[PDB]
Amino acid sequence: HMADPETAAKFKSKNAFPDPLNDPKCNPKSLVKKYLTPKVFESLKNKKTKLGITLWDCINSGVVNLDSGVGVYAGDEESYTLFGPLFDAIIEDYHSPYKLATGHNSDMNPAHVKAPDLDPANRYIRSTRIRVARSLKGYGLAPGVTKAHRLEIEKKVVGVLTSLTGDLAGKYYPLSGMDEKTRQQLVDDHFLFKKGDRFLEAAGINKEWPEGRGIYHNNDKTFLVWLNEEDHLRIISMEKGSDIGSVFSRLCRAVNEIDKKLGFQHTKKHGYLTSCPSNLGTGMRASVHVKIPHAKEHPDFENILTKYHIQARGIEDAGVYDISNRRRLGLSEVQCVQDMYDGVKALMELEKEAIAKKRSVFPEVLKNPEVKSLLRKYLTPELFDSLKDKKTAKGISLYDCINSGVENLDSSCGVYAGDEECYTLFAPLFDKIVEDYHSPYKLANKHTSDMNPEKVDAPNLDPEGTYIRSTRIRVARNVKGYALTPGLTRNERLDIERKVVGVLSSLTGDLAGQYYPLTGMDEATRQKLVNDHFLFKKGDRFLEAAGVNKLWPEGRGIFHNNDKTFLVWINEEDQLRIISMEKGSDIGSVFGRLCRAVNEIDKQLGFQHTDAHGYLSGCPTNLGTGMRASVHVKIPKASAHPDFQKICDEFHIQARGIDAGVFDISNRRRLGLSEVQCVQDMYNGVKKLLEIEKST
């Protein structure tokens, strides 16, 4: 249960049977204990491979580490035959029901896999990963490879890897000579490996550490190679989402190229040769993270697992399971992936059946009297019945839209739109909620957008900042051509991030700045952002239930200008949250800067917009202008003045408190007035508040 190398060495130096295998501490499930019998030991203790590999070399880790599951490593290919009486038994046990006599067939042609993307909307599956172990022709395996040959392997591999093009293009980092900065980065990406543990140590695998070891990854960070760790190659293809077809394609592309140029250790009986016999055959571990708490309780759950030879283990994450293959010998890589795909699909269809069933009925929780959401107010059972089966082109149902209000009974609204079509297809519900929250606006009135700052007449109110401390204007926007945030697929969100960053990086003048993706953000970048109050985090339970938090934090990021007067959040609650900000009183300048930035983005990308709703948002509260204009101002005199109420009411502004009696003055309306009108209203209102605070 800890390594005892000193005790093993006594027996090894005498070439005697390892007595500690008969030690009560030893794992009674140890394969080396089970099959290294005194007679097996006697028969094989004097044999050596061409590389000088002995039986003791092979069994050493299993004696040093008595808690071992397997407990042997092969120093070379010859070890599997010369020490066959040991390895054969171990293999056929671990890999049962596989029989070496049956033989193994490899298949790394991704075109043999039929895998249409299971879950692009990411309703169930969270991530997909495929890993294979390989060793190069012409060398011993990792426990027996010579110092010179490990270096030759690294060199040959790197030559192929750095030749890779397209999405496989990337960079190699040798462990030897790696600086602290790089080490930190690779840890942050979880790409780093360190000196092997007690098991690899005792196997002889750690020799010459860290010479000849290295890490390669593509620029997308969806392809990773560990070089000369436990095997010559550990090759991993991975990404968020469900697209195992694309993951396996990328894997195959790289592996076949290496195979072509270099060649792999491989036999009919064993498949690909690896250091540990657990990794023979396909040498593959395929893994999908999927949320299936309902399918788990189904009586056909274990039957599906058994049928496809997969296993389900536990991994915010309730109901999430790691589905993985149990088998590597007797099925091809193609077959493993297809079983993985078919198996997860069957498990997913179970979850979907359970959910469609529960969604087939009016949400009983809404019947409760003390629930006061607009959802409850307007969602009658007849309305529910007339709409519950209709779906948008992007696959959004009514229940998708109302889910957050059903899961969060204490919501105010409780309805999110997954896409533009929701506002039309589920209009009998959405119209009522829009006109309630945005009262007195009527959708029949329609909305006029206006982002021309020259139509605002705003001579600077308080140049000294005596009363007005800061001025802020934010707009929410969503990019035309996509779902809204709650309905986004993985690829849409990534496309949005890519195109927005593109526009933002092209911004010149006082709008020039830098982007900070959340994915792979370091401690110091974060801290810096927190200090400026620029950082955002994963959405709350309302956003979580609305489907807004999917694949967090992929596709999410932060941009700000050098002056820190311009800030953009990407794919937070809306696809775009755009903020212009200043100390002092100059609303015209803040709005002028905002318009310059928003209009440029509009021209390049386009926004989601209708005549009736103005700019579209997943949250109906952010429709129209999607604007929040904010002025921080010290107004003790006028807050007590009796024209105060009249002023706030005429100009549709409201004051809330916050260093002094600084009040936040913000706009009350978003639909029925243009951005220009909103800013002009704010200017006019604040002007009158100032005239009272300044009278003598």
Side-chain angles (χ1 to χ4, degrees):
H1 290 274
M2 194 153 175
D4 191 348
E6 303 84 359
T7 298
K10 290 194 209 195
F11 293 97
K12 181 171 177 100
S13 61
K14 285 180 237 176
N15 204 28
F17 183 87
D19 282 348
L21 293 190
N22 297 319
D23 257 72
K25 248 230 286 175
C26 189
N27 183 3
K29 303 285 249 303
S30 173
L31 294 188
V32 64
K33 154 159 198 163
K34 190 176 295 187
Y35 300 110
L36 185 80
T37 63
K39 288 304 189 171
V40 172
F41 190 84
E42 276 187 4
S43 174
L44 297 179
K45 68 186 192 184
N46 295 318
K47 307 197 180 182
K48 299 181 184 149
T49 76
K50 262 173 86 173
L51 304 199
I53 306 303
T54 71
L55 177 68
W56 249 110
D57 290 321
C58 288
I59 67 171
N60 191 54
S61 185
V63 189
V64 169
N65 310 285
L66 292 169
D67 59 324
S68 305
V70 181
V72 306
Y73 293 83
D76 54 16
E77 165 168 16
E78 182 180 353
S79 291
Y80 277 110
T81 293
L82 194 67
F83 308 118
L86 178 60
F87 284 98
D88 291 349
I90 291 183
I91 285 153
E92 292 187 346
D93 189 319
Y94 182 97
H95 290 276
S96 55
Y98 179 78
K99 292 307 164 49
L100 294 143
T102 305
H104 174 88
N105 295 281
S106 304
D107 184 4
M108 284 292 288
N109 191 334
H112 290 181
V113 165
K114 309 305 191 281
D117 197 14
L118 286 174
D119 184 27
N122 307 297
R123 297 175 176 269
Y124 305 101
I125 299 172
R126 291 178 172 198
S127 61
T128 296
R129 181 180 180 273
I130 309 180
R131 171 226 104 198
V132 289
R134 294 289 186 268
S135 300
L136 298 187
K137 284 170 175 151
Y139 310 102
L141 302 162
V145 69
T146 67
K147 177 168 168 63
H149 284 173
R150 186 185 286 105
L151 291 166
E152 184 168 300
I153 286 163
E154 174 190 26
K155 155 166 180 167
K156 274 144 94 142
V157 168
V158 170
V160 171
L161 292 185
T162 52
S163 85
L164 297 173
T165 58
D167 67 334
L168 282 175
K171 158 86 150 61
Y172 176 72
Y173 311 86
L175 294 199
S176 303
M178 180 188 293
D179 55 37
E180 168 63 16
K181 180 176 183 190
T182 300
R183 202 204 69 97
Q184 197 44 64
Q185 297 196 349
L186 291 167
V187 167
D188 282 350
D189 301 329
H190 300 127
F191 285 171
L192 199 77
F193 66 95
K194 308 177 192 184
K195 191 172 189 172
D197 59 22
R198 55 184 173 97
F199 295 93
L200 303 189
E201 176 68 21
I205 288 171
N206 274 340
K207 291 196 293 298
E208 323 300 344
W209 183 268
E211 180 170 81
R213 281 76 171 189
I215 295 168
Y216 178 92
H217 70 74
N218 64 348
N219 302 297
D220 294 333
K221 301 185 182 182
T222 57
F223 176 80
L224 170 69
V225 179
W226 284 1
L227 190 35
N228 286 324
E229 191 241 353
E230 178 179 322
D231 288 279
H232 301 172
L233 301 160
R234 188 192 288 197
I235 308 159
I236 309 135
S237 178
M238 71 291 182
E239 66 195 37
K240 286 184 183 299
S242 55
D243 202 345
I244 189 175
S246 169
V247 168
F248 189 54
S249 175
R250 179 166 62 249
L251 180 61
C252 286
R253 251 142 52 210
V255 174
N256 287 329
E257 175 59 24
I258 294 171
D259 195 346
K260 172 193 213 176
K261 294 294 181 53
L262 297 187
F264 292 142
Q265 299 183 42
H266 185 270
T267 71
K268 180 55 185 181
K269 205 160 44 185
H270 298 94
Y272 295 102
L273 304 176
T274 52
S275 306
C276 180
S278 63
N279 281 312
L280 297 170
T282 59
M284 175 181 295
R285 185 186 180 258
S287 163
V288 167
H289 290 192
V290 65
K291 180 158 190 288
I292 47 178
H294 296 104
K296 176 54 171 44
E297 317 299 330
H298 197 266
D300 290 12
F301 187 72
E302 292 293 333
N303 281 18
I304 294 166
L305 298 187
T306 301
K307 171 148 141 75
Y308 297 107
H309 317 118
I310 54 184
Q311 58 197 332
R313 291 279 210 78
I315 245 52
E316 180 222 333
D317 308 338
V320 183
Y321 288 74
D322 182 19
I323 314 300
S324 67
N325 56 307
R326 263 186 294 210
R327 299 180 167 187
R328 296 185 176 101
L329 272 170
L331 82 172
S332 67
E333 292 82 353
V334 158
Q335 283 177 321
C336 181
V337 174
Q338 200 66 72
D339 288 349
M340 207 68 217
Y341 177 83
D342 296 347
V344 171
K345 182 180 177 173
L347 294 171
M348 188 171 79
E349 288 292 330
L350 278 193
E351 189 69 20
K352 285 160 64 175
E353 281 180 20
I355 288 161
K357 189 203 175 179
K358 169 150 28 173
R359 294 191 162 191
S360 64
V361 149
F362 189 88
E364 208 74 19
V365 306
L366 290 182
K367 306 207 168 192
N368 193 340
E370 272 202 85
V371 170
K372 299 298 163 58
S373 65
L374 300 174
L375 173 59
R376 195 279 192 99
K377 184 175 184 186
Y378 293 119
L379 190 75
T380 80
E382 310 82 37
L383 193 152
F384 178 74
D385 284 336
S386 55
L387 299 176
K388 65 196 197 73
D389 295 319
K390 303 179 162 197
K391 290 184 153 182
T392 76
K394 296 175 181 67
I396 314 298
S397 72
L398 177 71
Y399 219 117
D400 287 333
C401 291
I402 74 172
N403 191 70
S404 193
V406 170
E407 291 298 331
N408 302 275
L409 303 137
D410 75 306
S411 325
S412 290
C413 312
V415 189
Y416 290 83
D419 60 23
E420 165 166 355
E421 189 174 347
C422 287
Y423 283 104
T424 297
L425 183 50
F426 309 118
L429 179 62
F430 277 91
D431 289 355
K432 289 173 185 65
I433 285 142
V434 165
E435 290 185 345
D436 192 306
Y437 178 86
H438 294 280
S439 181
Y441 179 79
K442 312 300 174 180
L443 289 153
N445 300 163
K446 296 175 171 188
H447 178 89
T448 303
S449 305
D450 194 345
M451 294 293 284
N452 186 346
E454 295 183 8
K455 299 171 70 181
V456 172
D457 198 320
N460 198 17
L461 289 184
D462 186 14
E464 307 85 356
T466 305
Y467 305 100
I468 304 170
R469 304 267 71 230
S470 65
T471 296
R472 184 177 178 271
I473 305 174
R474 169 268 278 179
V475 297
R477 292 289 185 267
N478 291 271
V479 180
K480 191 181 178 179
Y482 299 95
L484 293 162
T485 295
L488 287 179
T489 65
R490 170 165 192 264
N491 291 334
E492 288 181 289
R493 182 183 298 104
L494 289 168
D495 285 347
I496 288 161
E497 186 200 13
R498 191 185 84 261
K499 307 214 288 207
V500 174
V501 171
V503 180
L504 294 185
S505 70
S506 81
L507 292 183
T508 58
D510 64 337
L511 288 183
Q514 56 254 12
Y515 178 68
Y516 302 105
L518 259 49
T519 298
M521 177 175 300
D522 67 74
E523 191 56 69
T525 296
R526 179 151 22 224
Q527 190 54 70
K528 157 171 135 27
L529 291 169
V530 191
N531 293 343
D532 284 338
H533 284 322
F534 287 180
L535 192 72
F536 65 88
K537 279 171 162 55
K538 209 216 243 189
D540 64 27
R541 62 190 158 100
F542 299 104
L543 296 179
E544 177 67 33
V548 170
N549 283 335
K550 297 194 197 82
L551 306 189
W552 192 266
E554 178 173 85
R556 278 75 173 203
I558 300 163
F559 174 94
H560 74 77
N561 69 344
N562 299 317
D563 294 338
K564 285 80 195 171
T565 54
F566 180 71
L567 175 68
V568 184
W569 286 352
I570 304 180
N571 286 322
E572 192 247 344
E573 184 177 0
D574 288 280
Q575 294 158 17
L576 296 170
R577 190 203 249 213
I578 311 174
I579 307 176
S580 185
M581 27 173 24
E582 289 186 7
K583 292 196 230 278
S585 59
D586 201 351
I587 308 108
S589 173
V590 172
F591 187 54
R593 181 179 319 106
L594 178 66
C595 281
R596 282 158 42 218
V598 172
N599 287 330
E600 181 57 39
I601 298 171
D602 198 1
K603 161 200 177 81
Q604 291 202 47
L605 302 180
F607 299 140
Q608 302 185 36
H609 185 270
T610 69
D611 291 343
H613 308 86
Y615 295 102
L616 297 180
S617 176
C619 187
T621 64
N622 270 276
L623 296 173
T625 61
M627 174 177 288
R628 187 180 132 89
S630 188
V631 161
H632 284 195
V633 70
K634 304 185 184 190
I635 308 289
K637 301 209 301 177
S639 65
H641 204 272
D643 282 348
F644 189 66
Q645 161 210 262
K646 300 179 185 51
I647 289 165
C648 291
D649 286 344
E650 168 164 22
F651 295 105
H652 315 309
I653 55 180
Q654 61 184 340
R656 304 206 145 154
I658 305 168
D659 314 325
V662 171
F663 294 69
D664 180 287
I665 316 258
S666 64
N667 62 292
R668 285 231 263 146
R669 304 177 168 185
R670 285 166 182 170
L671 273 161
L673 79 177
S674 70
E675 291 84 349
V676 159
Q677 286 175 311
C678 173
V679 175
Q680 186 70 71
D681 281 345
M682 176 63 63
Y683 178 85
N684 290 341
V686 173
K687 186 181 203 298
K688 295 199 164 187
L689 299 179
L690 268 195
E691 275 154 355
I692 295 177
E693 210 65 31
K694 269 166 43 177
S695 47
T696 177

PDB file of all heavy atoms in Angstrom, residues 460-480:
ATOM      1  N   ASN A 460     -21.912  68.676 -21.479  1.00  0.00           N
ATOM      2  CA  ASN A 460     -21.476  68.026 -20.235  1.00  0.00           C
ATOM      3  C   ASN A 460     -22.020  68.675 -18.958  1.00  0.00           C
ATOM      4  O   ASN A 460     -21.814  69.862 -18.714  1.00  0.00           O
ATOM      5  CB  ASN A 460     -19.945  67.935 -20.177  1.00  0.00           C
ATOM      6  CG  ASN A 460     -19.457  66.910 -19.161  1.00  0.00           C
ATOM      7  OD1 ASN A 460     -20.215  66.044 -18.713  1.00  0.00           O
ATOM      8  ND2 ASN A 460     -18.183  67.005 -18.795  1.00  0.00           N
ATOM      9  N   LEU A 461     -22.709  67.878 -18.146  1.00  0.00           N
ATOM     10  CA  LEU A 461     -23.448  68.387 -16.992  1.00  0.00           C
ATOM     11  C   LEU A 461     -22.583  68.899 -15.844  1.00  0.00           C
ATOM     12  O   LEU A 461     -22.789  70.010 -15.353  1.00  0.00           O
ATOM     13  CB  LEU A 461     -24.410  67.319 -16.465  1.00  0.00           C
ATOM     14  CG  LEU A 461     -25.602  67.040 -17.369  1.00  0.00           C
ATOM     15  CD1 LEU A 461     -26.549  66.038 -16.733  1.00  0.00           C
ATOM     16  CD2 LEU A 461     -26.311  68.346 -17.662  1.00  0.00           C
ATOM     17  N   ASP A 462     -21.622  68.083 -15.419  1.00  0.00           N
ATOM     18  CA  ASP A 462     -20.875  68.343 -14.192  1.00  0.00           C
ATOM     19  C   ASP A 462     -19.377  68.099 -14.381  1.00  0.00           C
ATOM     20  O   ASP A 462     -18.828  67.154 -13.816  1.00  0.00           O
ATOM     21  CB  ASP A 462     -21.421  67.442 -13.075  1.00  0.00           C
ATOM     22  CG  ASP A 462     -20.814  67.744 -11.716  1.00  0.00           C
ATOM     23  OD1 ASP A 462     -20.186  68.809 -11.567  1.00  0.00           O
ATOM     24  OD2 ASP A 462     -20.976  66.907 -10.798  1.00  0.00           O
ATOM     25  N   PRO A 463     -18.707  68.957 -15.177  1.00  0.00           N
ATOM     26  CA  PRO A 463     -17.268  68.862 -15.468  1.00  0.00           C
ATOM     27  C   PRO A 463     -16.366  68.658 -14.244  1.00  0.00           C
ATOM     28  O   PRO A 463     -15.294  68.063 -14.381  1.00  0.00           O
ATOM     29  CB  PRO A 463     -16.946  70.220 -16.122  1.00  0.00           C
ATOM     30  CG  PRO A 463     -18.154  71.085 -15.886  1.00  0.00           C
ATOM     31  CD  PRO A 463     -19.303  70.135 -15.830  1.00  0.00           C
ATOM     32  N   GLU A 464     -16.793  69.137 -13.078  1.00  0.00           N
ATOM     33  CA  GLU A 464     -15.985  69.044 -11.863  1.00  0.00           C
ATOM     34  C   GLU A 464     -16.190  67.715 -11.127  1.00  0.00           C
ATOM     35  O   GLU A 464     -15.384  67.337 -10.272  1.00  0.00           O
ATOM     36  CB  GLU A 464     -16.301  70.213 -10.921  1.00  0.00           C
ATOM     37  CG  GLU A 464     -16.206  71.607 -11.559  1.00  0.00           C
ATOM     38  CD  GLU A 464     -17.487  72.033 -12.271  1.00  0.00           C
ATOM     39  OE1 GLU A 464     -18.432  71.216 -12.345  1.00  0.00           O
ATOM     40  OE2 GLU A 464     -17.550  73.187 -12.754  1.00  0.00           O
ATOM     41  N   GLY A 465     -17.272  67.016 -11.453  1.00  0.00           N
ATOM     42  CA  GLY A 465     -17.595  65.768 -10.781  1.00  0.00           C
ATOM     43  C   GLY A 465     -18.040  65.971  -9.342  1.00  0.00           C
ATOM     44  O   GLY A 465     -17.949  65.058  -8.516  1.00  0.00           O
ATOM     45  N   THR A 466     -18.521  67.176  -9.049  1.00  0.00           N
ATOM     46  CA  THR A 466     -18.982  67.533  -7.713  1.00  0.00           C
ATOM     47  C   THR A 466     -20.176  66.668  -7.318  1.00  0.00           C
ATOM     48  O   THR A 466     -20.289  66.214  -6.173  1.00  0.00           O
ATOM     49  CB  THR A 466     -19.395  69.017  -7.661  1.00  0.00           C
ATOM     50  OG1 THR A 466     -18.308  69.834  -8.116  1.00  0.00           O
ATOM     51  CG2 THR A 466     -19.784  69.427  -6.242  1.00  0.00           C
ATOM     52  N   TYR A 467     -21.056  66.432  -8.286  1.00  0.00           N
ATOM     53  CA  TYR A 467     -22.282  65.691  -8.048  1.00  0.00           C
ATOM     54  C   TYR A 467     -22.297  64.369  -8.809  1.00  0.00           C
ATOM     55  O   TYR A 467     -22.660  63.327  -8.248  1.00  0.00           O
ATOM     56  CB  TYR A 467     -23.491  66.550  -8.427  1.00  0.00           C
ATOM     57  CG  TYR A 467     -23.511  67.880  -7.712  1.00  0.00           C
ATOM     58  CD1 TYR A 467     -23.085  69.040  -8.347  1.00  0.00           C
ATOM     59  CD2 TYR A 467     -23.935  67.970  -6.392  1.00  0.00           C
ATOM     60  CE1 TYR A 467     -23.086  70.256  -7.688  1.00  0.00           C
ATOM     61  CE2 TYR A 467     -23.946  69.173  -5.726  1.00  0.00           C
ATOM     62  CZ  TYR A 467     -23.520  70.316  -6.378  1.00  0.00           C
ATOM     63  OH  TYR A 467     -23.532  71.518  -5.708  1.00  0.00           O
ATOM     64  N   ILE A 468     -21.902  64.409 -10.080  1.00  0.00           N
ATOM     65  CA  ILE A 468     -21.881  63.197 -10.893  1.00  0.00           C
ATOM     66  C   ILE A 468     -20.516  62.526 -10.845  1.00  0.00           C
ATOM     67  O   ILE A 468     -19.535  63.062 -11.359  1.00  0.00           O
ATOM     68  CB  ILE A 468     -22.290  63.472 -12.351  1.00  0.00           C
ATOM     69  CG1 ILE A 468     -23.667  64.135 -12.393  1.00  0.00           C
ATOM     70  CG2 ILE A 468     -22.308  62.172 -13.135  1.00  0.00           C
ATOM     71  CD1 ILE A 468     -24.076  64.681 -13.760  1.00  0.00           C
ATOM     72  N   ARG A 469     -20.463  61.343 -10.235  1.00  0.00           N
ATOM     73  CA  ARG A 469     -19.195  60.652 -10.011  1.00  0.00           C
ATOM     74  C   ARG A 469     -18.789  59.728 -11.161  1.00  0.00           C
ATOM     75  O   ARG A 469     -17.599  59.606 -11.467  1.00  0.00           O
ATOM     76  CB  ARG A 469     -19.233  59.878  -8.689  1.00  0.00           C
ATOM     77  CG  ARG A 469     -19.574  60.739  -7.474  1.00  0.00           C
ATOM     78  CD  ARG A 469     -18.327  61.272  -6.758  1.00  0.00           C
ATOM     79  NE  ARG A 469     -17.609  62.300  -7.507  1.00  0.00           N
ATOM     80  CZ  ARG A 469     -16.300  62.270  -7.745  1.00  0.00           C
ATOM     81  NH1 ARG A 469     -15.569  61.258  -7.295  1.00  0.00           N
ATOM     82  NH2 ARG A 469     -15.718  63.249  -8.430  1.00  0.00           N
ATOM     83  N   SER A 470     -19.767  59.075 -11.792  1.00  0.00           N
ATOM     84  CA  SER A 470     -19.477  58.174 -12.911  1.00  0.00           C
ATOM     85  C   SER A 470     -20.687  57.978 -13.839  1.00  0.00           C
ATOM     86  O   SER A 470     -21.833  58.201 -13.438  1.00  0.00           O
ATOM     87  CB  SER A 470     -18.953  56.820 -12.404  1.00  0.00           C
ATOM     88  OG  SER A 470     -19.935  56.121 -11.660  1.00  0.00           O
ATOM     89  N   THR A 471     -20.418  57.566 -15.077  1.00  0.00           N
ATOM     90  CA  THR A 471     -21.464  57.398 -16.085  1.00  0.00           C
ATOM     91  C   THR A 471     -21.225  56.097 -16.838  1.00  0.00           C
ATOM     92  O   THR A 471     -20.106  55.842 -17.286  1.00  0.00           O
ATOM     93  CB  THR A 471     -21.473  58.575 -17.083  1.00  0.00           C
ATOM     94  OG1 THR A 471     -21.804  59.786 -16.393  1.00  0.00           O
ATOM     95  CG2 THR A 471     -22.502  58.339 -18.178  1.00  0.00           C
ATOM     96  N   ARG A 472     -22.264  55.275 -16.971  1.00  0.00           N
ATOM     97  CA  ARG A 472     -22.106  53.940 -17.532  1.00  0.00           C
ATOM     98  C   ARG A 472     -23.276  53.615 -18.453  1.00  0.00           C
ATOM     99  O   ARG A 472     -24.438  53.842 -18.095  1.00  0.00           O
ATOM    100  CB  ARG A 472     -22.059  52.920 -16.393  1.00  0.00           C
ATOM    101  CG  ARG A 472     -21.801  51.471 -16.795  1.00  0.00           C
ATOM    102  CD  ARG A 472     -21.703  50.606 -15.538  1.00  0.00           C
ATOM    103  NE  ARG A 472     -21.505  49.185 -15.818  1.00  0.00           N
ATOM    104  CZ  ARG A 472     -22.490  48.305 -15.988  1.00  0.00           C
ATOM    105  NH1 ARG A 472     -23.759  48.688 -15.918  1.00  0.00           N
ATOM    106  NH2 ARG A 472     -22.206  47.036 -16.230  1.00  0.00           N
ATOM    107  N   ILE A 473     -22.983  53.090 -19.637  1.00  0.00           N
ATOM    108  CA  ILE A 473     -24.055  52.624 -20.518  1.00  0.00           C
ATOM    109  C   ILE A 473     -23.727  51.254 -21.082  1.00  0.00           C
ATOM    110  O   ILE A 473     -22.681  51.066 -21.709  1.00  0.00           O
ATOM    111  CB  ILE A 473     -24.338  53.601 -21.679  1.00  0.00           C
ATOM    112  CG1 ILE A 473     -24.640  55.008 -21.152  1.00  0.00           C
ATOM    113  CG2 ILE A 473     -25.502  53.088 -22.520  1.00  0.00           C
ATOM    114  CD1 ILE A 473     -24.779  56.068 -22.250  1.00  0.00           C
ATOM    115  N   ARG A 474     -24.632  50.306 -20.853  1.00  0.00           N
ATOM    116  CA  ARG A 474     -24.456  48.926 -21.291  1.00  0.00           C
ATOM    117  C   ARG A 474     -25.558  48.546 -22.274  1.00  0.00           C
ATOM    118  O   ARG A 474     -26.706  48.961 -22.104  1.00  0.00           O
ATOM    119  CB  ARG A 474     -24.510  47.990 -20.076  1.00  0.00           C
ATOM    120  CG  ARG A 474     -24.609  46.491 -20.397  1.00  0.00           C
ATOM    121  CD  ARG A 474     -26.063  46.001 -20.464  1.00  0.00           C
ATOM    122  NE  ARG A 474     -26.625  45.708 -19.148  1.00  0.00           N
ATOM    123  CZ  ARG A 474     -27.871  45.296 -18.945  1.00  0.00           C
ATOM    124  NH1 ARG A 474     -28.694  45.136 -19.975  1.00  0.00           N
ATOM    125  NH2 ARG A 474     -28.296  45.043 -17.713  1.00  0.00           N
ATOM    126  N   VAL A 475     -25.224  47.744 -23.285  1.00  0.00           N
ATOM    127  CA  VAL A 475     -26.259  47.114 -24.106  1.00  0.00           C
ATOM    128  C   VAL A 475     -26.003  45.614 -24.215  1.00  0.00           C
ATOM    129  O   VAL A 475     -24.858  45.167 -24.293  1.00  0.00           O
ATOM    130  CB  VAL A 475     -26.400  47.740 -25.525  1.00  0.00           C
ATOM    131  CG1 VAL A 475     -26.838  49.190 -25.444  1.00  0.00           C
ATOM    132  CG2 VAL A 475     -25.110  47.613 -26.312  1.00  0.00           C
ATOM    133  N   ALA A 476     -27.078  44.839 -24.185  1.00  0.00           N
ATOM    134  CA  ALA A 476     -26.993  43.415 -24.470  1.00  0.00           C
ATOM    135  C   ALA A 476     -27.285  43.234 -25.951  1.00  0.00           C
ATOM    136  O   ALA A 476     -28.198  43.859 -26.483  1.00  0.00           O
ATOM    137  CB  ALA A 476     -28.005  42.647 -23.642  1.00  0.00           C
ATOM    138  N   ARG A 477     -26.524  42.373 -26.617  1.00  0.00           N
ATOM    139  CA  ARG A 477     -26.778  42.088 -28.025  1.00  0.00           C
ATOM    140  C   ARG A 477     -26.549  40.605 -28.282  1.00  0.00           C
ATOM    141  O   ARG A 477     -25.762  39.963 -27.579  1.00  0.00           O
ATOM    142  CB  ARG A 477     -25.867  42.929 -28.925  1.00  0.00           C
ATOM    143  CG  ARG A 477     -26.138  44.436 -28.925  1.00  0.00           C
ATOM    144  CD  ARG A 477     -27.451  44.767 -29.641  1.00  0.00           C
ATOM    145  NE  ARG A 477     -27.655  46.212 -29.758  1.00  0.00           N
ATOM    146  CZ  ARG A 477     -28.331  46.946 -28.880  1.00  0.00           C
ATOM    147  NH1 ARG A 477     -28.886  46.374 -27.812  1.00  0.00           N
ATOM    148  NH2 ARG A 477     -28.453  48.253 -29.067  1.00  0.00           N
ATOM    149  N   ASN A 478     -27.250  40.057 -29.271  1.00  0.00           N
ATOM    150  CA  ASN A 478     -26.960  38.701 -29.718  1.00  0.00           C
ATOM    151  C   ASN A 478     -26.669  38.688 -31.214  1.00  0.00           C
ATOM    152  O   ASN A 478     -27.220  39.500 -31.960  1.00  0.00           O
ATOM    153  CB  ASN A 478     -28.082  37.741 -29.326  1.00  0.00           C
ATOM    154  CG  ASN A 478     -28.147  37.518 -27.819  1.00  0.00           C
ATOM    155  OD1 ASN A 478     -27.490  36.624 -27.284  1.00  0.00           O
ATOM    156  ND2 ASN A 478     -28.915  38.354 -27.126  1.00  0.00           N
ATOM    157  N   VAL A 479     -25.780  37.793 -31.638  1.00  0.00           N
ATOM    158  CA  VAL A 479     -25.277  37.804 -33.013  1.00  0.00           C
ATOM    159  C   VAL A 479     -26.245  37.129 -33.989  1.00  0.00           C
ATOM    160  O   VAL A 479     -26.716  36.012 -33.749  1.00  0.00           O
ATOM    161  CB  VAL A 479     -23.867  37.166 -33.101  1.00  0.00           C
ATOM    162  CG1 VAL A 479     -23.357  37.192 -34.528  1.00  0.00           C
ATOM    163  CG2 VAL A 479     -22.891  37.896 -32.192  1.00  0.00           C
ATOM    164  N   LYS A 480     -26.551  37.819 -35.085  1.00  0.00           N
ATOM    165  CA  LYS A 480     -27.522  37.325 -36.054  1.00  0.00           C
ATOM    166  C   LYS A 480     -27.047  36.021 -36.685  1.00  0.00           C
ATOM    167  O   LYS A 480     -25.851  35.840 -36.939  1.00  0.00           O
ATOM    168  CB  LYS A 480     -27.786  38.375 -37.137  1.00  0.00           C
ATOM    169  CG  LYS A 480     -28.984  38.043 -38.020  1.00  0.00           C
ATOM    170  CD  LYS A 480     -29.212  39.096 -39.094  1.00  0.00           C
ATOM    171  CE  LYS A 480     -30.391  38.705 -39.971  1.00  0.00           C
ATOM    172  NZ  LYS A 480     -30.667  39.718 -41.018  1.00  0.00           N
TER     173      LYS A 480
END
